[PDB]
């Protein structure tokens, strides 16, 4: 299928909430080798976020049930095997995405916006892998996530206004990485609060096409801050 029809189908799948089909379309677009526009990047992002989100939620539920189950109970093995199945699906999705990011997207990005977006995605999917990792594997996965986030964070501070949605989304997810993965609430709050304040100081100059996106992210930054400080 051609790119125009793939995009067409991906938007249909999104409306129908068939995110498997959507991700399949956007993977095909990605593998065609051409740089993605802002619209196409967000379609790729939304597709695989919903695909992986189902596994993340499933994994949490099953892991919580596993941890409440007595180690003597003979049904524990069934729970563990099921957890490992969902975990294996989650790692496969993350691997597919990180493979797309390194093979096509980050490699061929010609602007800092694309590079920051893809590096943010890289931090996101290493972070999802870190949620389900243990021991040294967890440490190395955490380093890979932080490295991607940090690189995108420096490029965004050097190349984007604080009100740019990509820079705000990066701040939002990076601060959550500090809170949930690194377990540093004070640095997470400072990171979110800093991006929030720098965006407010410049909000009056924002373009009306980015109001809805920038302000939406700012609402989320503030919600996280309110939760973390209460």
């Amino acid at each position: 299928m051609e790119k125009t029809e793939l995009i067409q189908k991906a938007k249909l799948a999104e409306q129908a909430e068939r995110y498997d089909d959507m991700a399949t379309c956007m993977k095909a677009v990605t593998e065609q080798g051409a740089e993605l526009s802002n619209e196409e990047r967000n379609l790729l992002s939304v597709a695989y976020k919903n695909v992986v989100g189902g596994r993340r939620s499933a994994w949490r539920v099953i892991s919580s049930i596993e941890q409440k189950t007595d180690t003597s109970d003979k049904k524990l093995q069934l729970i563990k095997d099921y957890r490992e199945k969902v975990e294996s699906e989650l790692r496969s999705i993350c691997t597919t995405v990180l493979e797309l990011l390194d093979k096509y997207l980050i490699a061929n990005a010609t602007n800092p916006e694309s590079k920051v977006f893809y590096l943010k995605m890289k931090g996101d999917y290493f972070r999802y892998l870190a949620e389900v990792a243990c021991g040294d594997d967890r440490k190395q996965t955490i380093d890979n996530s932080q490295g991607a986030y940090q690189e995108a964070f420096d490029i965004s501070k050097k190349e984007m206004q604080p009100t740019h949605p990509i820079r705000l989304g990066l701040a939002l997810n990076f601060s959550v990485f500090y809170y949930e993965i690194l377990n540093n609430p004070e640095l997470a709050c400072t990171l979110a609060k800093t991006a929030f304040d720098e965006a407010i100081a410049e909000l009056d100059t924002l373009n009306e096409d980015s109001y809805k996106d920038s302000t939406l992210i700012m609402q989320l930054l503030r919600d996280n801050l309110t939760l973390w400080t209460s």
Binding site: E17, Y19, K49, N50, G53, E180, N224, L227
Partner: peptide, 10 residues
């Protein structure tokens, strides 16, 4: 209450 990240799954 979860920490909010983007994009958000529907």
């Amino acid at each position: 209450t979860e920490n909010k990240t983007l994009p958000r799954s529907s």
